[PDB]
Structure 1
Amino acid sequence: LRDLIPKHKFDNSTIDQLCKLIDNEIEPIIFDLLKWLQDYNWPIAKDILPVVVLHQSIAMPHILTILQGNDIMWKYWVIKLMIPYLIYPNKQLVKSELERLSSLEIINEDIREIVNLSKDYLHFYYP
């Protein structure tokens, strides 16, 4: 199934073949798929998004990981693109991460962007 993971930044070749796979099925590669969301400007990232959203239930653990992670850009995309499409339980699963991130002291400027994304999403998707 690993052959199903995009091998580079433009690799849309396996998508039609991932669209067939399901929740039980795709989980073994699901975190690798998410790695494509590190930069949304990769032409592949846009193709991957909908797949990882459809299969958001099996992706939750791994979505947490990314938010506890040390990639600023990665969790920024994951927050910006995915939170809005989490179903109530899943959406509630990440509240804590959004909470923590909104909390960080703004040392560098990249930190700012993601504090602000979190305050605003919390503000919008939780009221």
Structure 2
Amino acid sequence: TSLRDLIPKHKFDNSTIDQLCKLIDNEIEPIIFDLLKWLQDYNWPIAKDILPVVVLHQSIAMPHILTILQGNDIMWKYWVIKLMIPYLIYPNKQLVKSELERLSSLEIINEDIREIVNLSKDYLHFYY
């Protein structure tokens, strides 16, 4: 329950950031998904401090990242893909390729879809 207190409570809340920046992968794992939720919108002031943390602990983040990519929250997967994919070390990069391919193949029916299809296409082109 002490760990869960380290989770930001609102979009401006960096009170726990120093404590967070100190944990090892297995110390932060239990709340990694909770931290990833603060990337649903990167324009939230706290997203800029959460992002480095989750990238640094990317290896234990992966199953949760895939869940997001397999979800229906377009904005959330857009930020996750855009911000995290270029900073995934090789083995983790290969884990998410599947989702990028899938997303790049979607029919473009609105602008939100077009954004994530074109990002997926550019990222497959560049990174893989």
Which TM-score bucket, shorter chain as reference?
over 0.9
1:46 aligns with 2:62: no
> How far off is 1:53 after superposition?
0.4
1:85-122 alpha-carbon deviations (Å, 9 max, x no partner): 00000000000000000000011211000000000000
The runs of at least 4 aligned residues of structure 1 exceeding 3 Å deviation read none
Q: CA deviation at 1:2?
A: 0.6
Superposed CA offset, 1:19-60 (max 9, x none): 111101101000010000010000000000000000000000
Q: How many residues align?
A: 126
Matches within 5 A, 1:1-127: 1-126=3-128
Q: Secondary structure at the match of 1:43?
A: coil
- 5+ residue gaps, structure 2, are none
Compute the displacement of 1:9 (Å). 0.3
- What TM-score, normalized to structure 2? 0.97
Deviation for aligned residue 1:124: 0.1
Determine the C-alpha separation between the residues in 2 that align with 1:69 and 1:32. 15
Query: 1:89, 1:20 → 2: CA distance?
Result: 24
The percent identity for this pair of structures is: 100
CA distance in 1, matches of 2:14, 2:74: 25
CA RMSD, Structure 1 to Structure 2 (Å): 0.4
